[PDB]
Design a protein around this ligand. Structure first.
Ligand SMILES: [Zn+2]
Length: 112
């Protein structure tokens, strides 16, 4: 993946879109198409990572830390879902997909 950066909340709009596309990998979990789930998750993850850092930098310092922490949890669960796909476990994939959805809602709530 190659990315072309964007400014404050042009990037939050794109982050919200990558976040939604991430919700969409459940179908890959259901068909158990692990490599597809991983490639899609990876791309979305790369966009999301870049745009959240951007949205964070242009955030009043009083709320940078808070978003940064929700952002950090999100990428931990995203990684964990990539790991679950890597080891081909419907169990773990389902668990981390769950945690990922909850972490996305948290970041979305702080967005908009
Ligand atoms: Zn910090």
């Amino acid at each position: 993946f190659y990315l072309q950066p964007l400014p404050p909340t042009e990037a939050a709009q794109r982050a919200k879109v990558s976040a939604s596309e991430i919700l969409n990998v459940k179908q890959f979990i259901d068909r158990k198409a692990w490599p597809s789930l991983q490639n899609d998750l990876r791309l979305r993850a790369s966009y999301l990572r870049y745009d959240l850092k951007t949205v964070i930098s242009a955030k009043p310092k009083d709320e940078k830390k808070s978003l940064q922490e929700l952002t950090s949890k999100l990428f931990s669960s995203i990684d964990n879902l990539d790991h679950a796909a890597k080891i081909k476990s419907p169990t773990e994939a389902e668990k981390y997909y769950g945690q990922t959805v909850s972490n996305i809602n948290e970041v979305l709530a702080k967005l908009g």
